[PDB]
Design a protein around this ligand. Sequence first.
Ligand SMILES: NC(=O)c1ccc[n+]([C@@H]2O[C@H](COP(=O)([O-])OP(=O)(O)OC[C@H]3O[C@@H](n4cnc5c(N)ncnc54)[C@H](O)[C@@H]3O)[C@@H](O)[C@H]2O)c1
Ligand SMILES: NC(=O)c1ccc[n+]([C@@H]2O[C@H](COP(=O)([O-])OP(=O)(O)OC[C@H]3O[C@@H](n4cnc5c(N)ncnc54)[C@H](O)[C@@H]3O)[C@@H](O)[C@H]2O)c1
Ligand SMILES: NC(=O)c1ccc[n+]([C@@H]2O[C@H](COP(=O)([O-])OP(=O)(O)OC[C@H]3O[C@@H](n4cnc5c(N)ncnc54)[C@H](O)[C@@H]3O)[C@@H](O)[C@H]2O)c1
Ligand SMILES: NC(=O)c1ccc[n+]([C@@H]2O[C@H](COP(=O)([O-])OP(=O)(O)OC[C@H]3O[C@@H](n4cnc5c(N)ncnc54)[C@H](O)[C@@H]3O)[C@@H](O)[C@H]2O)c1
Lengths: 21, 22, 336, 336, 336, 336
Amino acid sequence: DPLEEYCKDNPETNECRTYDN
Amino acid sequence: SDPLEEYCKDNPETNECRTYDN
Amino acid sequence: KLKVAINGFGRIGRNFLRCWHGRKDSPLDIIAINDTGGVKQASHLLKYDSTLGIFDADVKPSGETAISVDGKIIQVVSNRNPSLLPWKELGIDIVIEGTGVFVDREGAGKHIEAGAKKVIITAPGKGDIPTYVVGVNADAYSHDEPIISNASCTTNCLAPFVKVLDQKFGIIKGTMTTTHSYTGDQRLLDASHRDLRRARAAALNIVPTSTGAAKAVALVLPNLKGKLNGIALRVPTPNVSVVDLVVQVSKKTFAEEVNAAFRDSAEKELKGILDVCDEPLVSVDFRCSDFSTTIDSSLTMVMGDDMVKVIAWYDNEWGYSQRVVDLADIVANNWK
Amino acid sequence: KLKVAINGFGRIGRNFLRCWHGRKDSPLDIIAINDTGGVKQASHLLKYDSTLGIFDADVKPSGETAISVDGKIIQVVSNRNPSLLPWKELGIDIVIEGTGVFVDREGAGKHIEAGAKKVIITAPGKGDIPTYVVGVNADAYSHDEPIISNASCTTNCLAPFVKVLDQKFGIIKGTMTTTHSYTGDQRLLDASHRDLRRARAAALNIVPTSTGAAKAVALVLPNLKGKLNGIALRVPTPNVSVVDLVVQVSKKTFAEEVNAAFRDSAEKELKGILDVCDEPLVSVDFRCSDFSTTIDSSLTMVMGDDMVKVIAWYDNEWGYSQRVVDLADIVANNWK
Amino acid sequence: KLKVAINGFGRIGRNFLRCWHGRKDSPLDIIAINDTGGVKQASHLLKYDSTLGIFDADVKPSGETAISVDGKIIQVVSNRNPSLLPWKELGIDIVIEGTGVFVDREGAGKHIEAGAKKVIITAPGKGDIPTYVVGVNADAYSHDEPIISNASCTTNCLAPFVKVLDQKFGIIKGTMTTTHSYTGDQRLLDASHRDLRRARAAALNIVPTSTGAAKAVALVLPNLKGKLNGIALRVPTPNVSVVDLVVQVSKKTFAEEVNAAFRDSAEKELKGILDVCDEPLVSVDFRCSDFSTTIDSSLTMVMGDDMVKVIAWYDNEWGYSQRVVDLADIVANNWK
Amino acid sequence: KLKVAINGFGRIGRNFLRCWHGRKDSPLDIIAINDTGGVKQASHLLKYDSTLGIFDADVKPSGETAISVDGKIIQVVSNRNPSLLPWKELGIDIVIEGTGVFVDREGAGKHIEAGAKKVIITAPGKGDIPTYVVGVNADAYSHDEPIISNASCTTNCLAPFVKVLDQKFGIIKGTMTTTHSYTGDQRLLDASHRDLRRARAAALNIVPTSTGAAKAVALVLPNLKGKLNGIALRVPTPNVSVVDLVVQVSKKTFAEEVNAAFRDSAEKELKGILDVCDEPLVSVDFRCSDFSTTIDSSLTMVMGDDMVKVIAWYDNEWGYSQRVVDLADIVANNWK
Ligand SMILES: NC(=O)c1ccc[n+]([C@@H]2O[C@H](COP(=O)([O-])OP(=O)(O)OC[C@H]3O[C@@H](n4cnc5c(N)ncnc54)[C@H](O)[C@@H]3O)[C@@H](O)[C@H]2O)c1
Ligand SMILES: NC(=O)c1ccc[n+]([C@@H]2O[C@H](COP(=O)([O-])OP(=O)(O)OC[C@H]3O[C@@H](n4cnc5c(N)ncnc54)[C@H](O)[C@@H]3O)[C@@H](O)[C@H]2O)c1
Ligand SMILES: NC(=O)c1ccc[n+]([C@@H]2O[C@H](COP(=O)([O-])OP(=O)(O)OC[C@H]3O[C@@H](n4cnc5c(N)ncnc54)[C@H](O)[C@@H]3O)[C@@H](O)[C@H]2O)c1
Ligand SMILES: NC(=O)c1ccc[n+]([C@@H]2O[C@H](COP(=O)([O-])OP(=O)(O)OC[C@H]3O[C@@H](n4cnc5c(N)ncnc54)[C@H](O)[C@@H]3O)[C@@H](O)[C@H]2O)c1
């Protein structure tokens, strides 16, 4: 879960980036 | 008939002929 | 002539810039770029591309803030906050949201706060953002819409041939799997990530990833609602991908007719969009294909007379960008 | 004790020999190997594998004609033509024909003519010929049968679960696709091949190869006759593949249920043959899995109530090499 | 009986745990792990690995802030600020810095201000940080050293044979090039990077990059100050690397006498750190090699009597990690 | 107008044709192709290519034994025995022996013994065949030489700057290493090969392999006889290689001075054969370079005054082929 939150403010980071392909 | 296919008949284990199904 | 700016100069953005540079007599005029990295980096990566190859254009710095592409001067700004871009200052008519982080109205809306009149998200929009796949429902666009989406690359592939499949043989329901070239969203080696699939070595494995680019078809094709869904598999090829569709039409048929049907679209209402390939090529042969979807006729199947299976090749980066330019042209022409 | 010989020390010929080595107490006793290659050029080729790592076992050649796995001398011969193989003079009951060169009776027969009682075609059989999948019908094999055919790895996986699905929902029609690691039949770079596709550079392409594994199901399961079909997709992976099955059925069902059937057959009729994965994994995770078919629970989709899509991973080399080591116990123990 | 924390559960923090796991009687005890993610990724990626495969052990979450590895339970923290880590809370004794962003004295001292009594950078240090290499000088460590460095993967391979080379022939000057596997520092596809080269698709390219290992060796091999230099070549292999060293020696010699010397060493002092391989192997054949340096004796040439060229193999992830532990133990065994 | 025929339509064979094709005012008119395959494989592979792209030219067949490129027809023969080739009726003047099998008077001669007048082995001649490297010694070609060699790809790269270096600093003795792309000669997956190392999967290893480049240089640059040695390292890249050279020179120098020299030569005698790149580029960027050798100025180093390290890039298929076309022009210009 820690990561989910991190991502919410750093959507473009390595451990977040999510593309529809 | 093409050349490669005839060759393949006799030399099936070649690089240019090997054909594994899956 | 509209003034464009590219926000987020990553894979899509650069492809876009080249796709655009390609068009003859374009309604667009790219005047600005913005990426976190600055001029020096923008110019390099634009010139040298491990995929697209070496840009056959005269790229090089202009002043200390802009770059010149065949004499065309493009300002290169650098702000992580869309809200603070000189759009109002540069007179930007449209923004190509290519960052992949500003997809909802709040996000992209900032570009309008910043002074630009329209955002065109290069990915699945969020919220009630109007989506469009050129050649299907790109006609639905009205100038009232400031922020719009262009869907995903996969969605831009299915829509055109699913439009043909449901149109003619009427689609009852279907599933889909796209064997896709990995993308920037995956790790090079096993390092943390939110999606435990994408956290694994991209160029080593076959990674499966929940898409949603299937259901998305509903947006551009009102009908298909709840009928489609699917998944994707990521494979060790940096570019070009393929769509695997298994529909269930009502009107029974056979391959020769299916592909026959496609060929007709190909010259009718989907010229420059849909393409059918009869020669036995492989992924890489479709690098730089201006077609959102190319069918592999020699692969079409039909089981039980009604269970239709089609195969489609698409250049995830290039083609989609070619579309994005078209969509912009559309925007630029129905400019109220 | 049922003296065994490996003809065609390829990926399988070598993989197989290793499964065997690791068997708790096999009835088979491999004594000879016949490869076009060399003897030491085979002892080394065994000890070191790029896909399986280092073969744990003292692999030092013994004399200029044999090897010596863990002390067990294993004569090594080299003759292209089968008919000249020392099977009679050596005393061979079972020959593992893993060359994919001789697939039919006419060909494979050259083994019996040389002195081989019963042979095993590690690949789909050609023309008329007994096919049996270890776990779906490794019983229909009568000792009257002199030449078997352990089918293809795509089939030996796309069957143990095609069974669970037709006899519990009743498969009507149906199609399939397999995203498979490339294999020896594909060129490393663009050379000539009788088929203009396996000709293309392996590791840098998604190559669509024609497969039989589909109609191949309509053999080890008479039932599915004329129903299953589909194609194959070669991709930049050295090992481990995945089948994407999509069949339409009668009995209404949902994705979740579909997964319980499998979990059941998992510890019953398909124990050690079929397994279900409730984890979010990738290809490399299933390397050296003894299950000729492992379902990925999280991917199962069910559109329209009946049309169901299931995903199964299979280590095409090692997994298959296990079923083959078994269709040999099914012979050795059930030996007249 | 020594509490250990792993800051940065990345490719190195993880091999360390697994290196340590397989340890016969460790003086250490991995108390916790810290990164950005928690147990979800911590656990998942410790059980799986697109390089080291499945970890044989019961790796399962143990609450929502800890994990269970074969019974023993390891806390799992998640703050990016080392000052905030409960190092005093859990009473950690030594920290494995593998975040790659706290290599500087100021930054590494944060674990010390948060509790930990000693830190170890899994990389070269910046500031007043003692650098140690096992087999070369880790026998100069002093218990009063709060923070130290284990150098890099490359220097660790290089330092060993340079020690033998210099001590037995006297190096005048020399150069080295390490053909190294890509790393998490590079990009999957052309993405931004401070380094315009590492910013290029790591699996499609041979990427030149600088290395400070050649000057680093003088840190642990004083007599080498200013005699070496070199660069690195990043090639599309996930792990394992090779350094290509060329040195002008003082004492004229020959390929065979050199290897002879390398052998004497792998037996007397560098026994266990250096290993002269004789088999005609390849990169993969070196996975998990517990040696810092394995010299391919077959490759060893000697041009014109004093220009020596040596080629040494090493596992950047695994071989290094073992050294880390080893040094970690050297720290343990000097405590107080 | 010398008629040409290409023996062995492999990588070099097709790359050769494409090179020639784009030449303005050529003295060569190629009208014949031989390879185990027929018009099928040929027409297709000259059009599609996983490395050079889709050959931009009308590539369709003519007769079931010939093809046409932008008009001009070219017979497509298919006999594995050169002695039996229609070289005498097609008035064949020069043959491009690139099957990599007929590389000694013993072999290539057969081409003359079939009607052809000259042979150019796209590889080192076996034994004592006149070897030429354009820009270095091809001007030393003489018409009464029936069979000649164009050296290997590595030698053509290496020769040009080794020439400059010797000329301006004097090579005393050096060492080389070329990290090379994998070639057809390698196995896709661990299969049999005369060489154990080349037997291992190309797209997954760092493969140590012997080269005769350091030696072959002495042929075209006589003062280098007995002064150079070195190995090769095949890596997971499909094209474009790099040679890492380290020499001990007589004139003390510094990096800047070496780069200066290469540039002087690049603009004069080695105009079009040698280049110096002053940008942070990677492998892919060098694809399709007409230069035999291009220096990575930034990488150049000089240790201890006279130990120079230079790193050059080259496209082994396209680069080489351009030189083979060149040698052929030379031949055609001194015809008698
Ligand atoms: N790869 C494809 O073929 C493809 C196809 C269709 C749609 N898409 C979608 O397009 C989006 C981008 O994909 P991509 O492959 O170009 O990715 P990418 O990683 O190459 O591009 C992201 C770029 O945005 C920049 N960026 C990040 N945060 C920013 C900020 N706040 N301000 C400005 N720039 C910022 C990055 O530095 C980088 O230049 C994703 O949402 C993806 O789903 C991708
Ligand atoms: N590896 C897999 O994924 C796989 C799995 C299941 C079934 N198969 C099937 O197995 C067959 C072979 O596959 P493989 O991966 O082992 O390939 P392979 O190329 O490594 O094996 C062929 C081997 O046979 C030898 N050989 C060739 N001709 C011979 C002859 N006339 N006499 C003696 N030896 C000869 C070769 O030197 C080689 O060692 C194909 O039919 C394929 O469809 C492959
Ligand atoms: N890969 C190799 O071969 C290798 C060899 C020797 C030394 N090293 C060194 O090891 C270190 C890491 O390299 P790696 O290859 O394992 O990389 P990596 O990306 O896999 O690991 C870095 C890890 O640190 C975490 N991290 C980053 N910032 C953090 C912070 N502020 N707080 C907590 N965790 C944080 C990341 O999420 C990740 O798990 C670097 O110092 C590197 O130079 C790497
Ligand atoms: N690609 C390179 O990097 C490169 C560079 C320089 C020199 N070379 C040399 O050039 C030669 C060819 O190399 P390539 O890479 O193009 O190889 P390749 O394998 O792609 O092409 C050789 C071709 O000749 C055919 N062939 C085999 N035996 C034949 C016969 N008896 N008669 C007619 N055709 C036959 C093959 O089927 C194939 O199409 C080799 O000697 C190689 O060492 C290669």
